[PDB]
Amino acid sequence: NAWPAWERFKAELVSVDGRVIDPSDERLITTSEGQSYALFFALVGNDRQTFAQLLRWTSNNLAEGDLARHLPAWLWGRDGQQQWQVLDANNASDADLWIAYSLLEAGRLWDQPAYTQLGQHLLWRIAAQTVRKLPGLGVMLLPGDYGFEDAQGTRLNPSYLPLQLLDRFSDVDPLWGELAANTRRLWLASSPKGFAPDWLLWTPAGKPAADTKHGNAGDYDAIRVYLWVGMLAEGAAQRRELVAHYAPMAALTQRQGLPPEHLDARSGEARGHGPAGFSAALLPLLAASPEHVAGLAAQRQRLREQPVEAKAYYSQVLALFGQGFDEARYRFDPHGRLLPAWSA
Amino acid sequence: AWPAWERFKAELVSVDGRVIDPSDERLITTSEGQSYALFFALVGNDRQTFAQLLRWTSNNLAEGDLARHLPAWLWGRDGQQQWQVLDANNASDADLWIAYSLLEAGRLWDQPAYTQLGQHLLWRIAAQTVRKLPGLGVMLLPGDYGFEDAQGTRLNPSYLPLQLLDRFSDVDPLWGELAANTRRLWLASSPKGFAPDWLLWTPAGKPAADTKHGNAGDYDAIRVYLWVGMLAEGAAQRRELVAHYAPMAALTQRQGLPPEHLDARSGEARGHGPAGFSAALLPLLAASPEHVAGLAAQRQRLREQPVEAKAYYSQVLALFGQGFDEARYRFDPHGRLLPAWS
Numbered sequence: 001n002a003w004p005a006w007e008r009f010k011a012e013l014v015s016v017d018g019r020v021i022d023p024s025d026e027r028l029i030t031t032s033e034g035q036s037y038a039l040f041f042a043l044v045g046n047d048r049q050t051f052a053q054l055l056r057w058t059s060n061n062l063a064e065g066d067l068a069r070h071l072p073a074w075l076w077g078r079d080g081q082q083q084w085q086v087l088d089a090n091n092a093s094d095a096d097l098w099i100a101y102s103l104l105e106a107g108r109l110w111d112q113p114a115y116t117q118l119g120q121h122l123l124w125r126i127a128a129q130t131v132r133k134l135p136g137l138g139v140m141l142l143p144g145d146y147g148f149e150d151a152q153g154t155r156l157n158p159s160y161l162p163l164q165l166l167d168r169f170s171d172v173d174p175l176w177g178e179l180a181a182n183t184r185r186l187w188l189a190s191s192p193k194g195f196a197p198d199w200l201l202w203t204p205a206g207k208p209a210a211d212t213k214h215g216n217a218g219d220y221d222a223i224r225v226y227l228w229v230g231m232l233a234e235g236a237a238q239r240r241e242l243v244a245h246y247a248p249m250a251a252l253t254q255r256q257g258l259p260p261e262h263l264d265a266r267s268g269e270a271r272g273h274g275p276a277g278f279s280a281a282l283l284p285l286l287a288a289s290p291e292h293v294a295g296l297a298a299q300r301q302r303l304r305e306q307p308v309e310a311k312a313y314y315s316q317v318l319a320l321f322g323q324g325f326d327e328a329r330y331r332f333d334p335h336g337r338l339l340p341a342w343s344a
Numbered sequence: 345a346w347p348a349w350e351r352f353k354a355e356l357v358s359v360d361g362r363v364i365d366p367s368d369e370r371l372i373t374t375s376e377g378q379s380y381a382l383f384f385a386l387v388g389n390d391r392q393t394f395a396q397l398l399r400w401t402s403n404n405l406a407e408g409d410l411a412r413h414l415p416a417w418l419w420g421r422d423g424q425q426q427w428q429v430l431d432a433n434n435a436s437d438a439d440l441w442i443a444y445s446l447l448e449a450g451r452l453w454d455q456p457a458y459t460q461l462g463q464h465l466l467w468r469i470a471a472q473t474v475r476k477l478p479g480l481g482v483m484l485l486p487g488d489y490g491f492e493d494a495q496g497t498r499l500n501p502s503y504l505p506l507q508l509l510d511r512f513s514d515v516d517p518l519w520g521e522l523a524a525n526t527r528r529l530w531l532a533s534s535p536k537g538f539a540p541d542w543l544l545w546t547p548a549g550k551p552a553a554d555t556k557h558g559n560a561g562d563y564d565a566i567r568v569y570l571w572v573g574m575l576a577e578g579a580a581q582r583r584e585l586v587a588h589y590a591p592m593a594a595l596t597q598r599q600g601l602p603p604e605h606l607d608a609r610s611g612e613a614r615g616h617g618p619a620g621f622s623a624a625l626l627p628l629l630a631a632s633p634e635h636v637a638g639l640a641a642q643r644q645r646l647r648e649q650p651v652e653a654k655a656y657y658s659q660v661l662a663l664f665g666q667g668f669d670e671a672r673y674r675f676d677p678h679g680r681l682l683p684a685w686s
Contacts, residue, residue, distance in 0.1 A: 068517065069521075120516070121516065121517065121518070124470060124516045124518045125482075125518055127467060127470040127471045127474075128470045128471075128474040128476070128482050128518055128522075129474075129475075129476040129482065131470075131471040131472075132472075133471070133472040133488050133489075139468075139471050139472065145476050173463070173464065173467040174411070174464065175464070175467040175468055175471055178412070179471075
């Protein structure tokens, strides 16, 4: 089991002391998202040492030494005094979820009770700090502990809520399965044309509306909705409904021979061509139904001719997820449990 | 055999398991009444009544499935003479007592189903009712809706007994953290050694007078002294907490009767409390040698004018406080229930 793409990511974007660096920002920032994705990839790659290093860096720098006591700050880097520190103390729940998931799964797959316990401690804190009971929806995860609720209602981000993770947490307590059912409803409701938005607003009347900041735009966040949907196991709840619901994204990509860059989730209008990351993000969805078998072959082909670039953080993580799945490096079972290719 | 618990069942618990407060013309049940009665039934080693109470609570306050719904706080006769939920919002103090009684019953009676249900409730309480408040950390709201706005967060110190939160820490340390925050909240809410019913926690992270009830402490606040007085000797900061609320013990001892109303800011007291207040203070009064005159005086008041028949509020305070005083139960340092029958 060699994972050259993961080795390339490490060589290019992961520091010796264990932080993931997006070099496109002048501040040479790390995000909790970056840490969380790299933790998942290290597990998939059976890379115990890098997992430990990533986890240590995340703990010490984003969580004051202790993920059982603090949800990680989302932004870290160099400030205006050239000092390396937390730049924004608020959390991003999408990273928190991926961190908690990778810990539970690593605890199971590597037989490390400490990882299991830490994951459970995180779930409790996520419930306590980040979950709310929303009107006409029920329990739902906010994008962060602060700054996403007001008079207008509640801002939500579909891509922050991968069903696999929520389904897996249901094994810890059914509250999470309930949150997963609520997410399935949110996803469908937010995507009337079969295209996901980056954000939406959940009004006090219990209805979806255009996001206060991004309207109905679907771009680099929303592309991940197709990725999660496409990686659902056959027997996962509402899998066929979800795959079929987002068919227009697959249908469009097949037709145009290329994924689009920008969507309006309300009108279904699409612009441009998406970067190679978008192609990789779509491989699972493209493989999920026979009617998109040509689309799958096409996109696989484009990635051969034009692989993701060296220091391009965003396209690299989409590739590691999507090409990684396409290359049979892992699967999810119907309950969201990780099935890695090394675990035989 | 617990005579007061037998009388409470005979007078205030219907055959199908609801606790009635007759002082209200709607003949209401509250989630509070259900939660207290569940705890009393455990203390009384009464499996039969526990099961019936739980069933009524689930069916009528929680849509038939308490694992999926925190119970409505208020049930009774509506305007069309129908017996129905009157307010579907929850009351957090009852939610906590229900989860706790379930966890402890599960342990003490060897009933995995109670244990599981108790854990489902904690997850839902964390998810729906807990918030991270500025300069305070994780904290329980009084209810899922209606207690937050631009002015800040309304909190109710008496909704947060340290025994329950300390006990929940066994489920996950996050609850012990909430218990520690509650210890800070209690102290901050009580600058003169007297608790208020309510407190505002402002956006700047400071305690302020409650928006609705100012600094008044009476019928909710009396229960803070009850919780504190029942803390086990090795419970975290127990001595500090008993000493902190000494002025309530001292005033009661000095006046010969508990006050009816306190102002938590000024420490000014007015009137005399009902028998329930005397019962509620017996554990605190017994907690320090120097309050023995008061312990004796309040025991004597309860003998002379015992808690009246069909008087919901005074009966529950007495089952708690007199029950403790009669050695029917204790708590261990981590909030686990130690019933006399066990």
